[PDB]
Amino acid sequence: MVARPPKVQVYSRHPAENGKPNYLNCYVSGFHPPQIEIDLLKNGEKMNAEQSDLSFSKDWSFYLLVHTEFTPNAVDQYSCRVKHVTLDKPKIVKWDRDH
Amino acid sequence: MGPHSLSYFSTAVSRPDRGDSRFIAVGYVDDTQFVRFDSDAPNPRMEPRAPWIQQEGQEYWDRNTRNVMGSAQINRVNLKTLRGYYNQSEAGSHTLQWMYGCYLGPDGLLLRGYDQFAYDGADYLALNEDLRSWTAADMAAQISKRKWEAADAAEHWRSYLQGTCVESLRRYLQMGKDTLQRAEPPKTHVTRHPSSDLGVTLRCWALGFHPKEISLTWQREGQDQSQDMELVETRPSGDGTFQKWAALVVPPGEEQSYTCHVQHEGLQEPLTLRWDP
Amino acid sequence: EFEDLTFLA
């Protein structure tokens, strides 16, 4: 069968408030085969973030959660970068407070 | 509520360049992961992933470790066998996935059991609802089906799913009662966002809820708006709760003609909300 | 509780 591309969402655990500690999540789902690179970035540089144990949904597609602590402010930008056989260049999704 | 369940999800990947494979297994009660195993880990063991399973003693951890180690070995052989059935090259990596488990009925008996396989993402072989026969997807899977018929594999599965699986599930529900048997309702609100047209985006949020099952819909004058709505996949917060949202574009000035509707087992009845600045 | 007899395909 044909490979299945990843869906990507980037979002905070709690509503963001500048100066308050929080957690930053990149949830990646719907993909096959399971080889994948998922990086959370701060101003375009890789963060050292924890990755969940590989699992899958009832349609056999894989999902992973990458997460770390952060303190949002008025300056720093965050994003998630994903590499997979279905993607001809890296998929980059920007974090904003409204999604 | 809905029925509780115990499930295990395992992934085996061949690695021809290394002469080996990697096996990863995870166990869940409902939406809550509670164990893992990874054959690449040094000194590999079945390991706790929820606080309430750490009360099990050494015999439990040794027994579960021995049994999942044995499955990792058998699934390494199965990768080689399936490459042969499909006459595939020895140089490529392939994936064999396995899911099995039990749902609990309101009387304490098995509601539904399952045991199924996929190769490279496609259904391969599955135990039928009767727990007494198998369904194969192609001519390769028929070979495996005949071996399992000859070995009476279904009798073994029937015994495990009606007995050990249900019994274990009931013990775990008691050990984790304060978290597993408690529902938390969603916190809800509607936001408004300027949008690229002269249309405005409304976004209905549900936050902090458990279990993961939820409905979010939009109406205008009793009329469902699903055909023009963006609904994101339900996503983990990271602390055992979930999030979801539903958004649509509406004409400017007309925002309060639209209502968001939320249903969740934590709610005493369904919620209606609107843009409420 | 993990199953205890994984079958050869």
Q: How many domains does chain A have?
A: 1
CATH assignment of the domain containing A95: 2.60.40.10
Reference B96, options B85, B113, B80, B112; nearest CA is B80
Same fold, B1-182 and B183-273: no
Contact B239 A13 (CB under 8 A): yes
How close, in Å, is residue A75 to chain B by CA atoms? 21
For B30-177, where are the E strands, in sequence order? 32-38, 47-48, 95-104, 110-119, 122-127, 134-136
Cross-sheet strand order for the sheet of B223-224: B223-224, B215-220, B259-263, B271-273
Contact B71 C3 (CB under 8 A): yes
User: What is the Cα–Cα distance from B236 to A65, expressed in whole angstroms?
Assistant: 8
Q: CB under 8 Å to B74, separation ≥6 — which residues?
A: C6, C7, C8
How close, in Å, is residue C6 to chain B by CA atoms? 6
CB nearest C7 (choices: B8, B67, B151): B151
Residue count (chain A): 99
Strand pairing class (B134-136; B187-195):
unpaired
The CA distances from residue A88 to A5, A82, A84, B61, B92, in Å, are 11, 11, 8, 44, 20
Residue with tokens 């949830």: A27
Strand pairing class (A78-83; A37-42):
antiparallel
Residues B29-53, buried b or exposed e (16+ Cβ, 10 A)? bbbbbbbbbbbeeeeeebeebbebb
Domain-by-domain residue ranges, chain B? 1-182, 183-273
User: What is the Cα–Cα distance from A27 to A36, expressed in whole angstroms?
Assistant: 13
The domain in which residue A2 lies consists of 1-99
Residue count (chain C): 9
Q: What's the token pair of residue B197? A: 């047209």
Phi, psi angles (nearest 5°) of residue B88:
-95, 155
User: What is the Cα–Cα distance from B134 to B124, expressed in whole angstroms?
Assistant: 11
Domain B1-182 has CATH 3.30.500.10: yes
Q: A84 in helix, strand or coil?
A: coil
Q: B30 in helix, strand or coil?
A: coil
User: What is the Cα–Cα distance from B102 to B27, expressed in whole angstroms?
Assistant: 12
Reference B7, options B93, B106, B153, B115; nearest CA is B115
Q: CB under 8 Å to A87, separation ≥6 — which residues?
A: A5, A6
- Looking at residue A37, its amino acid is E
User: What is the Cα–Cα distance from B20 to A99, expressed in whole angstroms?
Assistant: 42
Contact B100 C7 (CB under 8 A): no
User: What is the Cα–Cα distance from B170 to C3, expressed in whole angstroms?
Assistant: 16
Q: What is the CATH topology of the domain spanning B183-273? A: Immunoglobulin-like (2.60.40)
